[PDB]
Amino acid sequence: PDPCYDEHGLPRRCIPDFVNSAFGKEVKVSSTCGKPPSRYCVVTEKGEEQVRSCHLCNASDPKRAHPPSFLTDLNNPHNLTCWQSDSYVQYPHNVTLTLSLGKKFEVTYVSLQFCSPRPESMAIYKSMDYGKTWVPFQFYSTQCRKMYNKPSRAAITKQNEQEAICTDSHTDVRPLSGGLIAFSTLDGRPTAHDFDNSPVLQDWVTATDIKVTFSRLHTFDSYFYAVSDLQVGGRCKCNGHASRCVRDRDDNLVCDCKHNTAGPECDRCKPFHYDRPWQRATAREANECVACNCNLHARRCRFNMELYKLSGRKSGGVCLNCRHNTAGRHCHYCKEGFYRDLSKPISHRKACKE
């Protein structure tokens, strides 16, 4: 029931299913305690009092290790899975964790649940080029102006709708453990209520990797970073041209591009279906790609923009190499010297006789 087409076969927008993409994926952390085994300490406030409690981190005897998988795994609110770096780690040392998504994804949110008090200075970066460069996604720092040099909670008007602003809420110690930091990408952008026609916010959510630079916790002799469950929610960027993604031959995640579009993200038109410039599948117009018209006399075609504009943005469909002794934009008329045969249709393999 491919919903990427409606009842009577018409193309209509379709986007995949919202998932915990983080779920089950590997995180390349910058620190995991246990080797060599080491000392850490946890505060447990009971009433007025503060119960200092210290246990050891040893990797090669597993139960007291803290691997990256605790993050993206089944989190169950009893058996809670807190990853934990090497304790005693400070400023100005980029505790950079890096996740590899696997395909262009338009991210709704990024949420972290801390077992240690929510750090003071962290920052969400993002990579749209698949781990080649990085950019400020959103900052957290009770001292924003110094640390990340950004203004503390910058305002987002029509001119910086892609500047990561820098906040300081939920950067608070309490609760010691359990502090969840839920960042919404599109949150606070003046044109969020029209993402279908906001190509810039469509670029603000376009992400391929995520980097997290912890620079500083709070100033409480052990102290560390521990996180329980990590979720990167979002759908698969198919430009509204596929309602599900799948990995292919040599295992690489690409869309199920419909609408005669081509590409991993459907960004372009499949060969021959260049009759209309690829556009974004929005709320009402699939803006699908369309096969040219050659009357079955050709196999390839380009796209002429005058003929689009000069037609009034209708079709730039120009056939390449009309076979079967025809010619013309739509192979719609015989070659020179070959007369047309009224007994045979234009699409015949001998519609044109000598």
Contacts with ligand NAG by CB under 6 A lie at 30, 78-79, 94, 96
CB of 126 to ligand NAG, least distance (A): 15
Give whichever of 8 and 46 is closer to ligand NAG, judged by the CB atom.
46
Tell me the C-alpha distance between 168 and 218, whole Å. Answer: 13
Give whichever of 94 and 311 is closer to ligand NAG, judged by the CB atom.
94
Q: Which residues pair with 326 in a beta bridge?
A: 334
Give whichever of 92 and 337 is closer to ligand NAG, judged by the CB atom.
92
Give whichever of 95 and 301 is closer to ligand NAG, judged by the CB atom.
95
Residue the block writes with tokens 């949420």 = 111
CB of 72 to ligand NAG, least distance (A): 19
Give whichever of 167 and 215 is closer to ligand NAG, judged by the CB atom.
215
CB of 11 to ligand NAG, least distance (A): 45
CB of 86 to ligand NAG, least distance (A): 13
CB of 254 to ligand NAG, least distance (A): 30
Give whichever of 90 and 94 is closer to ligand NAG, judged by the CB atom.
94
CB of 80 to ligand NAG, least distance (A): 8
